[PDB]
Amino acid sequence: DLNRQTLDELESAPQTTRVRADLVSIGEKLVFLEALEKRIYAATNVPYP
Amino acid sequence: HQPLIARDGPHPIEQPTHNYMTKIIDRRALNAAFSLATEAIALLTGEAL
């Protein structure tokens, strides 16, 4: 066959938990929208890249 | 207490910093008056009864 069973599709579906995070729809696909100067770079002296 | 991040070269390697602070309590007060009258003092005591 050409369309084989792919090696990845034999693996287990891993265990999942719940995370609070912002989700935005643009076009036809969803997006994680996120700002990163409060979770990370809060009061540590490293420049925001 | 400050957290850290982990950098790569050629940046400096940082250490866990700490901060320690004490503040001095300022002091303020109040004022309020009451003034009575002379020939009403005898009325409270009883000299002019």
Side-chain angles (χ1 to χ4, degrees):
Chain A
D1 57 352
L2 190 144
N3 296 117
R4 291 180 184 87
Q5 185 60 255
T6 304
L7 189 149
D8 288 334
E9 294 178 352
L10 294 175
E11 293 179 352
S12 65
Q15 294 178 356
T16 60
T17 56
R18 184 64 61 85
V19 177
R20 184 177 177 89
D22 292 330
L23 289 170
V24 174
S25 69
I26 297 171
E28 293 179 354
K29 63 183 181 180
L30 297 170
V31 173
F32 290 91
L33 180 60
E34 181 67 29
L36 289 177
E37 64 182 3
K38 296 297 289 184
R39 299 290 180 89
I40 299 98
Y41 296 96
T44 63
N45 290 318
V46 181
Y48 183 72
Chain B
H1 298 278
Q2 292 180 356
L4 289 78
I5 61 107
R7 287 190 297 273
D8 193 359
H11 295 287
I13 301 170
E14 66 182 2
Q15 295 181 354
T17 61
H18 296 288
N19 291 320
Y20 293 99
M21 291 185 289
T22 59
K23 291 183 183 178
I24 296 170
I25 297 174
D26 189 73
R27 180 175 298 169
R28 290 179 184 176
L30 289 177
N31 289 313
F34 185 77
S35 65
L36 290 176
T38 61
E39 294 180 356
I41 297 168
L43 297 172
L44 294 173
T45 301
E47 294 179 356
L49 289 181

Coordinates of all heavy atoms in Angstrom, one line a residue:
Chain A
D1 N 0.8 -1.2 0.0 CA 0.0 0.0 0.0 C 0.9 1.2 0.0 O 2.0 1.2 0.4 CB -1.0 0.0 1.2 CG -0.3 -0.1 2.6 OD1 0.9 -0.3 2.6 OD2 -1.0 0.1 3.6
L2 N 0.4 2.3 -0.5 CA 1.1 3.6 -0.4 C 0.8 4.2 1.0 O 1.6 4.6 1.8 CB 0.8 4.5 -1.5 CG 1.6 5.8 -1.7 CD1 1.8 6.0 -3.2 CD2 1.0 7.0 -1.1
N3 N -0.5 4.5 1.2 CA -1.0 5.0 2.5 C -0.8 4.0 3.6 O -1.7 3.2 3.8 CB -2.4 5.5 2.4 CG -2.6 6.6 1.3 OD1 -3.3 6.5 0.3 ND2 -1.9 7.8 1.6
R4 N 0.3 4.1 4.3 CA 0.6 3.1 5.3 C 0.0 3.5 6.6 O -0.6 4.6 6.8 CB 2.1 2.9 5.5 CG 2.7 2.3 4.4 CD 4.2 2.1 4.5 NE 4.8 1.5 3.3 CZ 5.1 2.2 2.3 NH1 5.1 3.6 2.3 NH2 5.6 1.6 1.2
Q5 N 0.1 2.6 7.6 CA 0.0 3.0 9.0 C 1.2 3.7 9.4 O 2.3 3.1 9.5 CB -0.3 1.8 9.8 CG -0.5 2.1 11.3 CD -1.8 2.9 11.4 OE1 -1.7 4.1 11.7 NE2 -2.9 2.3 11.3
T6 N 1.1 5.0 9.7 CA 2.2 5.8 10.1 C 2.7 5.4 11.5 O 1.9 5.1 12.3 CB 1.9 7.3 10.0 OG1 1.4 7.6 8.7 CG2 3.0 8.3 10.3
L7 N 4.0 5.5 11.7 CA 4.6 5.1 13.0 C 4.1 5.9 14.1 O 4.0 5.4 15.2 CB 6.1 5.2 12.8 CG 7.2 4.8 13.9 CD1 8.4 4.4 13.1 CD2 7.5 5.8 14.9
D8 N 3.8 7.2 13.9 CA 3.3 8.0 15.0 C 1.9 7.6 15.4 O 1.5 7.7 16.6 CB 3.3 9.5 14.6 CG 4.6 10.1 14.5 OD1 5.5 9.6 15.2 OD2 4.8 11.0 13.7
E9 N 1.1 7.1 14.5 CA -0.3 6.9 14.7 C -0.5 5.5 15.5 O -1.7 5.1 15.6 CB -1.1 6.9 13.4 CG -1.2 8.3 12.8 CD -1.9 8.3 11.5 OE1 -2.3 7.2 11.0 OE2 -2.2 9.4 10.9
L10 N 0.5 4.9 15.9 CA 0.4 3.7 16.8 C 0.6 4.1 18.2 O 0.2 3.3 19.1 CB 1.5 2.7 16.4 CG 1.4 2.0 15.1 CD1 2.6 1.1 14.9 CD2 0.1 1.2 15.0
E11 N 1.1 5.3 18.5 CA 1.4 5.7 19.9 C 0.1 6.0 20.6 O -1.0 6.0 20.1 CB 2.2 7.0 19.9 CG 3.6 6.8 19.3 CD 4.4 8.1 19.4 OE1 3.8 9.1 19.7 OE2 5.6 8.0 19.1
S12 N 0.2 6.1 21.9 CA -0.9 6.4 22.8 C -1.3 7.8 22.8 O -0.4 8.7 22.6 CB -0.6 5.9 24.2 OG 0.4 6.7 24.8
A13 N -2.6 8.1 22.9 CA -3.0 9.5 23.2 C -2.6 9.8 24.6 O -3.1 9.2 25.5 CB -4.5 9.6 23.0
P14 N -1.8 10.8 24.8 CA -1.3 11.1 26.2 C -2.4 11.7 27.1 O -3.4 12.1 26.6 CB -0.1 12.1 26.0 CG -0.5 12.8 24.7 CD -1.2 11.7 23.9
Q15 N -2.1 11.7 28.4 CA -3.0 12.3 29.4 C -3.0 13.8 29.3 O -2.0 14.4 29.1 CB -2.6 11.8 30.8 CG -2.7 10.3 31.0 CD -2.3 9.9 32.4 OE1 -1.8 10.8 33.2 NE2 -2.5 8.7 32.7
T16 N -4.2 14.3 29.4 CA -4.4 15.8 29.2 C -5.1 16.4 30.4 O -5.9 15.8 31.1 CB -5.3 16.0 28.0 OG1 -6.6 15.4 28.2 CG2 -4.7 15.5 26.7
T17 N -4.7 17.6 30.7 CA -5.2 18.4 31.8 C -5.8 19.7 31.2 O -5.8 19.9 30.0 CB -4.2 18.7 32.9 OG1 -3.1 19.3 32.3 CG2 -3.8 17.5 33.6
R18 N -6.2 20.7 32.1 CA -6.8 21.9 31.7 C -6.0 23.1 32.0 O -5.4 23.2 33.1 CB -8.2 22.0 32.5 CG -9.0 23.2 32.0 CD -9.4 23.1 30.6 NE -10.2 21.9 30.4 CZ -11.5 21.8 30.6 NH1 -12.2 22.9 31.0 NH2 -12.2 20.7 30.3
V19 N -5.8 24.0 31.0 CA -5.0 25.2 31.1 C -5.8 26.4 30.7 O -6.5 26.4 29.7 CB -3.7 25.1 30.2 CG1 -2.9 26.4 30.3 CG2 -2.9 23.9 30.6
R20 N -5.8 27.5 31.5 CA -6.5 28.7 31.2 C -5.6 29.5 30.2 O -4.5 30.0 30.6 CB -6.7 29.5 32.5 CG -7.5 30.8 32.4 CD -7.8 31.4 33.7 NE -8.4 32.7 33.7 CZ -9.8 32.8 33.7 NH1 -10.5 31.8 33.7 NH2 -10.3 34.0 33.6
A21 N -6.1 29.7 29.0 CA -5.3 30.4 28.0 C -6.2 31.0 26.9 O -7.2 30.4 26.6 CB -4.2 29.6 27.4
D22 N -5.8 32.1 26.4 CA -6.7 32.9 25.4 C -6.7 32.3 24.0 O -5.6 31.9 23.5 CB -6.3 34.3 25.4 CG -6.6 35.0 26.7 OD1 -7.5 34.7 27.4 OD2 -5.8 36.0 27.0
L23 N -7.8 32.2 23.4 CA -8.0 31.6 22.1 C -8.8 32.5 21.1 O -9.9 32.9 21.5 CB -8.7 30.2 22.2 CG -7.7 29.2 22.9 CD1 -8.4 27.9 23.3 CD2 -6.6 28.9 21.9
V24 N -8.2 32.7 20.0 CA -8.7 33.7 19.0 C -8.9 33.0 17.6 O -7.9 32.2 17.2 CB -7.8 34.9 18.9 CG1 -8.2 35.8 17.8 CG2 -7.7 35.6 20.2
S25 N -10.0 33.2 17.0 CA -10.2 32.6 15.6 C -10.0 33.7 14.6 O -10.6 34.7 14.6 CB -11.6 32.1 15.5 OG -12.5 33.2 15.5
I26 N -9.0 33.4 13.7 CA -8.8 34.2 12.5 C -8.8 33.4 11.3 O -8.1 32.3 11.2 CB -7.4 34.9 12.6 CG1 -7.4 35.9 13.8 CG2 -7.1 35.7 11.4 CD1 -6.0 36.4 14.1
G27 N -9.6 33.8 10.3 CA -9.7 33.0 9.1 C -10.5 31.7 9.2 O -11.7 31.8 9.4
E28 N -9.8 30.6 9.2 CA -10.4 29.3 9.4 C -9.8 28.5 10.6 O -10.2 27.4 10.8 CB -10.4 28.5 8.2 CG -11.3 29.0 7.0 CD -11.2 28.1 5.8 OE1 -10.4 27.2 5.8 OE2 -11.9 28.4 4.8
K29 N -8.8 29.0 11.3 CA -8.1 28.3 12.3 C -7.9 29.1 13.5 O -7.9 30.3 13.5 CB -6.8 27.8 11.7 CG -5.8 28.9 11.4 CD -4.5 28.3 10.8 CE -3.5 29.3 10.5 NZ -2.3 28.7 9.9
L30 N -7.9 28.3 14.7 CA -7.8 28.9 16.0 C -6.3 29.3 16.3 O -5.4 28.8 15.6 CB -8.3 28.0 17.0 CG -9.7 27.7 16.8 CD1 -10.2 26.5 17.7 CD2 -10.5 28.9 17.2
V31 N -6.1 30.2 17.2 CA -4.8 30.7 17.6 C -4.7 30.8 19.1 O -5.6 31.4 19.7 CB -4.5 32.1 16.9 CG1 -3.3 32.7 17.4 CG2 -4.4 32.0 15.4
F32 N -3.6 30.3 19.7 CA -3.2 30.8 21.0 C -2.7 32.2 21.0 O -1.7 32.4 20.4 CB -2.2 29.9 21.6 CG -2.7 28.5 22.0 CD1 -2.6 27.5 21.0 CD2 -3.2 28.3 23.2 CE1 -3.1 26.2 21.4 CE2 -3.7 27.0 23.5 CZ -3.6 26.0 22.6
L33 N -3.5 33.2 21.5 CA -3.0 34.5 21.6 C -2.5 34.8 23.0 O -3.1 34.4 24.0 CB -4.1 35.5 21.3 CG -3.7 37.0 21.4 CD1 -2.6 37.3 20.4 CD2 -4.9 37.9 21.2
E34 N -1.3 35.3 23.1 CA -0.6 35.3 24.4 C 0.4 36.5 24.4 O 1.1 36.7 23.5 CB 0.1 34.0 24.6 CG 0.9 33.9 25.9 CD 0.0 33.9 27.1 OE1 -1.2 33.4 27.0 OE2 0.4 34.3 28.2
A35 N 0.4 37.2 25.6 CA 1.5 38.2 25.9 C 2.4 37.6 27.0 O 1.9 36.9 27.9 CB 0.8 39.5 26.4
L36 N 3.7 37.9 26.9 CA 4.7 37.2 27.7 C 5.5 38.0 28.5 O 6.7 37.7 28.8 CB 5.6 36.3 26.7 CG 4.9 35.1 26.1 CD1 5.9 34.4 25.2 CD2 4.4 34.2 27.2
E37 N 5.0 39.2 29.0 CA 5.8 40.0 29.9 C 5.1 40.0 31.3 O 5.4 41.0 32.1 CB 6.1 41.4 29.4 CG 4.9 42.3 29.1 CD 5.4 43.6 28.5 OE1 6.6 43.7 28.3 OE2 4.5 44.5 28.3
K38 N 4.3 39.1 31.6 CA 3.8 38.9 33.0 C 4.0 37.5 33.5 O 4.3 37.4 34.7 CB 2.3 39.3 33.1 CG 2.0 40.8 32.7 CD 2.6 41.7 33.7 CE 1.9 41.6 35.1 NZ 2.5 42.6 36.0
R39 N 3.8 36.5 32.7 CA 4.1 35.2 33.1 C 5.6 35.0 33.3 O 6.1 34.4 34.2 CB 3.5 34.1 32.2 CG 2.0 34.2 32.0 CD 1.4 33.6 33.3 NE -0.1 33.7 33.2 CZ -0.8 32.6 32.7 NH1 -0.1 31.5 32.3 NH2 -2.1 32.7 32.6
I40 N 6.3 35.5 32.2 CA 7.8 35.4 32.2 C 8.2 36.9 32.1 O 7.4 37.7 31.7 CB 8.3 34.5 31.0 CG1 7.8 33.1 31.2 CG2 9.8 34.4 30.9 CD1 6.6 32.7 30.4
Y41 N 9.4 37.2 32.5 CA 10.1 38.5 32.5 C 9.5 39.5 33.4 O 9.6 40.7 33.3 CB 10.1 39.2 31.1 CG 10.9 38.4 30.0 CD1 10.3 37.5 29.2 CD2 12.3 38.6 29.9 CE1 11.0 36.8 28.2 CE2 13.0 37.9 29.0 CZ 12.4 37.1 28.2 OH 13.1 36.4 27.2
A42 N 8.8 39.0 34.5 CA 8.2 39.8 35.5 C 9.3 40.0 36.6 O 9.6 39.0 37.3 CB 7.0 39.2 36.1
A43 N 9.9 41.2 36.7 CA 10.8 41.6 37.8 C 12.1 40.8 37.8 O 12.8 40.7 38.8 CB 10.2 41.5 39.2
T44 N 12.5 40.2 36.6 CA 13.8 39.7 36.4 C 14.4 40.5 35.3 O 13.8 40.9 34.3 CB 13.8 38.2 36.0 OG1 13.1 38.1 34.8 CG2 13.1 37.4 37.1
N45 N 15.7 40.8 35.4 CA 16.4 41.9 34.7 C 16.6 41.6 33.2 O 17.4 42.4 32.6 CB 17.7 42.2 35.3 CG 17.5 42.9 36.7 OD1 16.6 43.8 36.8 ND2 18.3 42.5 37.7
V46 N 16.0 40.6 32.6 CA 16.4 40.2 31.3 C 15.5 40.9 30.3 O 14.3 41.0 30.5 CB 16.2 38.6 31.2 CG1 16.6 38.1 29.9 CG2 17.0 38.1 32.3
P47 N 16.1 41.4 29.2 CA 15.3 42.2 28.2 C 14.3 41.3 27.5 O 14.6 40.1 27.1 CB 16.3 42.7 27.2 CG 17.5 41.8 27.4 CD 17.5 41.4 28.8
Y48 N 13.1 41.8 27.2 CA 12.0 41.1 26.5 C 12.4 41.0 25.1 O 12.6 42.1 24.4 CB 10.7 41.9 26.7 CG 9.5 41.2 26.1 CD1 9.0 40.1 26.7 CD2 8.9 41.8 25.0 CE1 7.9 39.5 26.1 CE2 7.8 41.2 24.5 CZ 7.3 40.1 25.0 OH 6.2 39.5 24.4
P49 N 12.5 39.8 24.5 CA 13.2 39.7 23.2 C 12.4 40.1 22.0 O 13.0 40.5 21.0 CB 13.4 38.2 23.2 CG 12.3 37.6 23.9 CD 12.0 38.6 25.0
Chain B
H1 N 11.7 38.3 47.0 CA 12.4 37.3 46.3 C 12.2 37.4 44.8 O 11.1 37.6 44.4 CB 12.0 35.9 46.9 CG 12.3 35.7 48.3 ND1 13.6 35.4 48.7 CD2 11.6 35.9 49.4 CE1 13.6 35.3 50.1 NE2 12.4 35.7 50.5
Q2 N 13.2 37.2 44.1 CA 13.2 37.3 42.6 C 13.4 35.9 42.0 O 14.3 35.2 42.5 CB 14.2 38.3 42.1 CG 13.8 39.7 42.5 CD 14.8 40.7 42.0 OE1 15.8 40.3 41.4 NE2 14.6 42.0 42.2
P3 N 12.7 35.6 41.0 CA 13.0 34.3 40.2 C 14.1 34.5 39.2 O 14.7 35.6 39.2 CB 11.6 34.0 39.5 CG 11.0 35.4 39.4 CD 11.4 36.2 40.6
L4 N 14.4 33.5 38.5 CA 15.4 33.6 37.4 C 14.9 33.0 36.1 O 13.8 32.5 36.0 CB 16.6 32.7 37.8 CG 17.7 33.0 38.8 CD1 17.1 32.5 40.1 CD2 18.9 32.1 38.5
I5 N 15.7 33.2 35.1 CA 15.6 32.5 33.8 C 17.0 32.0 33.5 O 17.9 32.4 34.2 CB 15.0 33.4 32.7 CG1 15.9 34.6 32.4 CG2 13.7 34.0 33.0 CD1 16.7 34.5 31.2
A6 N 17.1 31.1 32.5 CA 18.4 30.6 32.2 C 18.8 31.1 30.8 O 18.1 30.8 29.8 CB 18.3 29.0 32.2
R7 N 19.9 31.8 30.7 CA 20.4 32.4 29.5 C 21.4 31.4 28.8 O 21.7 30.3 29.3 CB 21.0 33.7 29.7 CG 20.0 34.9 30.0 CD 20.7 36.2 30.0 NE 21.7 36.4 31.0 CZ 21.5 36.8 32.2 NH1 20.2 37.1 32.6 NH2 22.4 37.0 33.1
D8 N 21.9 31.8 27.7 CA 22.9 31.2 26.9 C 24.0 32.2 26.6 O 23.7 33.4 26.7 CB 22.4 30.5 25.7 CG 23.3 29.5 25.0 OD1 24.5 29.4 25.5 OD2 23.0 28.9 24.0
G9 N 25.2 31.8 26.1 CA 26.2 32.7 25.7 C 25.9 33.5 24.5 O 25.0 33.2 23.7
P10 N 26.6 34.6 24.3 CA 27.6 35.2 25.3 C 27.1 36.1 26.4 O 27.8 37.1 26.7 CB 28.5 36.0 24.3 CG 28.3 35.5 23.0 CD 26.8 35.1 23.0
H11 N 25.9 35.8 26.9 CA 25.3 36.6 27.9 C 26.0 36.3 29.3 O 26.6 35.2 29.4 CB 23.8 36.4 28.0 CG 23.1 36.9 26.8 ND1 23.0 38.2 26.5 CD2 22.5 36.2 25.8 CE1 22.3 38.4 25.4 NE2 22.0 37.2 24.9
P12 N 25.9 37.2 30.3 CA 26.3 36.8 31.6 C 25.4 35.7 32.2 O 24.2 35.6 31.8 CB 26.2 38.1 32.4 CG 25.3 39.0 31.6 CD 25.6 38.6 30.2
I13 N 26.0 34.9 33.1 CA 25.2 34.0 33.9 C 24.7 34.7 35.2 O 25.5 35.4 35.9 CB 25.9 32.7 34.2 CG1 26.3 32.1 32.9 CG2 25.1 31.8 35.1 CD1 27.3 30.9 33.1
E14 N 23.4 34.7 35.5 CA 22.9 35.4 36.6 C 22.7 34.4 37.8 O 22.6 33.2 37.7 CB 21.6 36.0 36.3 CG 20.4 35.1 36.0 CD 19.2 35.8 35.6 OE1 19.2 37.0 35.5 OE2 18.2 35.1 35.4
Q15 N 22.6 35.0 39.0 CA 22.5 34.3 40.3 C 21.1 34.7 40.8 O 20.5 35.7 40.4 CB 23.6 34.8 41.2 CG 25.0 34.4 40.8 CD 26.1 34.8 41.7 OE1 25.8 35.5 42.7 NE2 27.3 34.3 41.5
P16 N 20.6 33.9 41.7 CA 19.3 34.3 42.5 C 19.6 35.5 43.3 O 20.4 35.4 44.3 CB 19.0 33.0 43.3 CG 20.2 32.3 43.4 CD 21.0 32.5 42.1
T17 N 18.9 36.6 43.1 CA 19.0 37.8 43.9 C 18.0 37.7 45.0 O 17.0 36.9 45.0 CB 18.7 39.0 43.0 OG1 17.4 39.0 42.4 CG2 19.8 39.1 41.9
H18 N 18.2 38.6 46.0 CA 17.2 38.7 47.1 C 17.2 40.2 47.5 O 18.2 40.9 47.3 CB 17.7 37.9 48.3 CG 17.6 36.4 48.0 ND1 16.5 35.7 47.9 CD2 18.6 35.5 47.9 CE1 16.7 34.4 47.7 NE2 18.0 34.3 47.7
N19 N 16.1 40.6 48.1 CA 15.9 41.9 48.6 C 15.4 41.9 50.0 O 14.5 41.0 50.3 CB 15.1 42.8 47.6 CG 15.8 43.1 46.3 OD1 16.9 43.3 46.3 ND2 15.0 43.0 45.3
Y20 N 15.8 42.8 50.8 CA 15.4 42.9 52.2 C 15.1 44.4 52.6 O 16.0 45.2 52.4 CB 16.4 42.3 53.1 CG 16.5 40.8 52.9 CD1 17.6 40.3 52.1 CD2 15.6 39.9 53.5 CE1 17.7 38.9 51.9 CE2 15.7 38.6 53.3 CZ 16.8 38.1 52.5 OH 16.9 36.7 52.4
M21 N 13.9 44.7 53.1 CA 13.5 46.0 53.3 C 12.8 46.2 54.7 O 12.1 45.3 55.2 CB 12.5 46.5 52.3 CG 13.2 46.7 50.9 SD 12.0 47.5 49.8 CE 10.9 46.1 49.6
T22 N 13.1 47.3 55.4 CA 12.4 47.8 56.5 C 11.9 49.2 56.3 O 12.6 50.0 55.7 CB 13.3 47.7 57.8 OG1 14.4 48.6 57.5 CG2 13.8 46.3 58.1
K23 N 10.8 49.5 56.9 CA 10.2 50.9 56.8 C 10.0 51.4 58.2 O 9.6 50.7 59.1 CB 9.0 50.9 56.0 CG 9.2 50.6 54.5 CD 7.9 50.7 53.7 CE 8.1 50.4 52.3 NZ 6.8 50.4 51.6
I24 N 10.0 52.7 58.3 CA 9.9 53.4 59.6 C 8.5 54.0 59.7 O 8.1 54.7 58.8 CB 11.0 54.5 59.8 CG1 12.3 53.8 59.8 CG2 10.7 55.3 61.0 CD1 13.5 54.8 59.7
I25 N 7.8 53.7 60.7 CA 6.4 54.2 60.9 C 6.5 55.7 61.3 O 7.0 56.1 62.3 CB 5.7 53.4 62.0 CG1 5.6 51.9 61.6 CG2 4.4 54.0 62.3 CD1 5.0 51.1 62.7
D26 N 5.9 56.5 60.4 CA 5.7 57.9 60.7 C 4.6 58.1 61.8 O 3.8 57.3 62.0 CB 5.4 58.7 59.4 CG 5.5 60.2 59.6 OD1 6.6 60.7 59.7 OD2 4.4 60.8 59.5
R27 N 4.7 59.3 62.4 CA 3.8 59.6 63.5 C 3.1 60.9 63.3 O 3.8 61.9 63.1 CB 4.5 59.6 64.9 CG 3.6 59.9 66.0 CD 4.4 59.7 67.3 NE 4.9 58.4 67.4 CZ 5.8 58.0 68.3 NH1 6.3 58.9 69.1 NH2 6.2 56.7 68.3
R28 N 1.7 60.9 63.4 CA 1.0 62.2 63.3 C -0.1 62.1 64.4 O -0.4 61.0 65.0 CB 0.4 62.4 61.9 CG 1.4 62.7 60.9 CD 0.7 62.9 59.5 NE 1.7 63.2 58.5 CZ 1.4 63.3 57.2 NH1 0.2 63.2 56.8 NH2 2.4 63.5 56.3
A29 N -0.7 63.2 64.7 CA -1.7 63.3 65.8 C -2.9 64.2 65.4 O -3.0 64.7 64.2 CB -1.0 63.9 67.0
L30 N -3.8 64.4 66.3 CA -5.0 65.2 66.1 C -5.1 66.3 67.2 O -4.4 66.3 68.2 CB -6.2 64.3 66.2 CG -6.5 63.4 65.0 CD1 -7.8 62.7 65.4 CD2 -6.8 64.2 63.8
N31 N -6.1 67.2 67.0 CA -6.4 68.3 67.8 C -7.9 68.7 67.7 O -8.4 68.7 66.6 CB -5.6 69.5 67.4 CG -4.1 69.4 67.8 OD1 -3.8 69.0 68.9 ND2 -3.2 69.6 66.8
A32 N -8.6 68.9 68.8 CA -10.0 69.3 68.8 C -10.3 70.0 70.1 O -9.9 69.5 71.2 CB -10.9 68.1 68.6
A33 N -11.1 71.1 70.0 CA -11.4 71.9 71.2 C -12.8 71.8 71.6 O -13.7 71.2 70.9 CB -10.9 73.3 71.0
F34 N -13.2 72.5 72.7 CA -14.4 72.2 73.4 C -15.1 73.4 74.0 O -16.3 73.3 74.3 CB -14.1 71.2 74.4 CG -15.3 70.7 75.2 CD1 -16.2 69.7 74.6 CD2 -15.5 71.1 76.5 CE1 -17.2 69.3 75.3 CE2 -16.6 70.7 77.2 CZ -17.5 69.7 76.6
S35 N -14.5 74.6 74.0 CA -14.6 75.7 75.0 C -15.9 75.9 75.7 O -17.0 76.0 75.0 CB -14.2 77.0 74.4 OG -15.1 77.4 73.4
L36 N -15.9 75.9 77.0 CA -17.0 76.2 77.9 C -17.2 77.7 78.2 O -16.5 78.5 77.6 CB -17.0 75.4 79.1 CG -17.2 73.9 79.0 CD1 -17.0 73.2 80.4 CD2 -18.6 73.6 78.5
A37 N -18.0 78.0 79.1 CA -18.2 79.4 79.5 C -18.3 79.5 81.1 O -18.7 78.5 81.7 CB -19.5 80.0 78.9
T38 N -18.0 80.6 81.6 CA -17.7 80.8 83.0 C -18.9 80.6 83.9 O -19.0 79.7 84.7 CB -17.1 82.2 83.3 OG1 -18.1 83.1 82.9 CG2 -15.9 82.4 82.5
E39 N -20.0 81.3 83.6 CA -21.2 81.3 84.4 C -22.1 80.1 84.0 O -23.2 80.0 84.5 CB -21.9 82.6 84.4 CG -21.2 83.7 85.1 CD -21.9 85.1 85.0 OE1 -23.0 85.2 84.4 OE2 -21.4 86.1 85.6
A40 N -21.6 79.2 83.2 CA -22.2 77.9 83.0 C -21.5 76.8 83.8 O -22.0 75.7 84.0 CB -22.2 77.5 81.5
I41 N -20.2 77.0 84.3 CA -19.5 76.1 85.1 C -20.2 75.9 86.5 O -20.4 74.8 87.0 CB -18.1 76.5 85.3 CG1 -17.4 76.5 83.9 CG2 -17.3 75.6 86.2 CD1 -16.0 77.1 83.9
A42 N -20.6 77.1 87.0 CA -21.4 77.1 88.3 C -22.7 76.4 88.2 O -23.2 75.8 89.2 CB -21.6 78.5 88.8
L43 N -23.3 76.4 87.0 CA -24.5 75.6 86.7 C -24.3 74.1 86.8 O -25.2 73.4 87.2 CB -25.1 76.1 85.4 CG -25.5 77.5 85.4 CD1 -25.9 78.0 84.0 CD2 -26.6 77.8 86.4
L44 N -23.2 73.7 86.3 CA -22.9 72.3 86.3 C -22.5 71.8 87.7 O -23.0 70.7 88.2 CB -21.8 71.9 85.3 CG -22.2 72.2 83.9 CD1 -21.0 72.0 83.0 CD2 -23.3 71.2 83.5
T45 N -21.7 72.6 88.4 CA -21.3 72.2 89.7 C -22.4 72.4 90.7 O -22.8 71.5 91.5 CB -20.1 73.1 90.2 OG1 -19.0 72.8 89.2 CG2 -19.6 72.6 91.5
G46 N -23.0 73.6 90.8 CA -24.1 73.9 91.7 C -24.0 75.1 92.5 O -24.8 75.4 93.4
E47 N -23.0 76.0 92.2 CA -22.8 77.2 93.0 C -23.9 78.2 92.8 O -24.1 79.1 93.7 CB -21.4 77.8 92.6 CG -20.2 76.9 93.0 CD -18.9 77.5 92.6 OE1 -18.9 78.6 92.0 OE2 -17.9 76.9 92.9
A48 N -24.6 78.2 91.7 CA -25.6 79.2 91.4 C -27.0 78.5 91.3 O -27.8 78.8 90.5 CB -25.3 80.0 90.1
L49 N -27.2 77.5 92.2 CA -28.5 76.9 92.3 C -29.3 77.5 93.4 O -28.8 78.1 94.3 CB -28.4 75.4 92.6 CG -27.8 74.5 91.5 CD1 -27.8 73.1 91.9 CD2 -28.7 74.7 90.2

